[PDB]
Design a protein around this ligand. Structure first.
Ligand SMILES: Nc1nc2c(ncn2[C@@H]2O[C@H](COP(=O)(O)OP(=O)(O)O)[C@@H](OP(=O)(O)O)[C@H]2O)c(=O)[nH]1
Ligand SMILES: [Mg+2]
Length: 170
């Protein structure tokens, strides 16, 4: 029994999940067990991973283009995954997140931040990640931060349940 397959209602739901390389995004995709990850290379050096099961679709790429903006406009949910143990690159994660949120095509996207790798000893917790990313500053933005360990699965249901509920009841 796959807990994610009935988590997104029955209407079309499109989610874009991005983040710096090594944040844990591909790990999350596999954990959903929603089918084969299809990799496309729309242009050399731009790798896109897609998972689709019935009404739910995840699109994934690393950050850090015209095609990006066409992916944006159809995006209802935006997930930003961050390596909570990588203090050296947390500011870079912030700048990439803020760059995406400045895009008009994502103006109405609901934002879920996965503060990933919470299993590691010296990982910043979700409150610290919230402050380092400046999420309290966000304007006209429906956002949530969820502590996760993608390799164990902890937190993934909780975050996606929050996001799905927001998308289905608004
Ligand atoms: N400790 C820990 N590691 C995690 C967690 N999530 C992902 N990882 C690990 O981090 C590395 C990068 O994950 P990946 O999903 O490839 O990230 P990406 O797709 O965002 O680039 C992988 O290890 P490798 O590259 O070494 O195989 C993966 O196993 C987590 O919650 N905790
Ligand atoms: Mg990857």
């Amino acid at each position: 029994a796959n807990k994610f397959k009935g988590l997104f209602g029955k209407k079309e739901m499109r989610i874009l999940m991005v983040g710096l390389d090594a944040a844990g995004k591909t790990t999350i995709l596999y954990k959903l067990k929603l089918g084969e990850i299809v990799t496309t290379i729309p242009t050399i050096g731009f790798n896109v991973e897609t998972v689709e099961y019935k009404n739910i679709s995840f699109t994934v790429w690393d950050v850090g283009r015209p095609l990006w903006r066409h992916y944006f406009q159809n995006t209802q949910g935006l997930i930003f995954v961050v390596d909570s143990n990588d203090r050296e690159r947390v500011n870079e994660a912030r700048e990439e997140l803020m760059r995406m949120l400045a895009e008009d095509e994502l103006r109405d996207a609901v934002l879920l931040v996965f503060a990933n790798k919470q299993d590691l000893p010296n990982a910043m917790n979700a409150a610290e990640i919230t402050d380092k990313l400046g999420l309290h500053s966000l304007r006209h933005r429906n956002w949530y931060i969820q502590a996760t360990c993608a390799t164990s699965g902890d937190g993934l249901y909780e975050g996606l349940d929050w996001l799905s509920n927001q998308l289905r009841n608004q």
